[PDB]
Amino acid sequence: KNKCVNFNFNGLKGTGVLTESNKKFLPFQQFGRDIADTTDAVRDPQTL
């Protein structure tokens, strides 16, 4: 965390910094998006 790296979560590949998010992902929600249809927050595999 806190250092921008390459991330590959379940086939979703990108670059950036990952931080502990304060979003309230409802239990049926996996990943979030922003106004331009790009991934903003993501849920981890293994530990949730």
Partner: protein
Amino acid sequence: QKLIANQFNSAIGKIQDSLSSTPSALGKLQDVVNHNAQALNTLVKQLS
């Protein structure tokens, strides 16, 4: 002189209320700001 001074003071007093009461007196500058915001937001949304 006194009457002219009183008239000028009354007009300058009323001008602030005239600006404050009407919420569409400053429409040109707001239009400029809104146009820039709309153009940028549309350019962002075209990425989807």
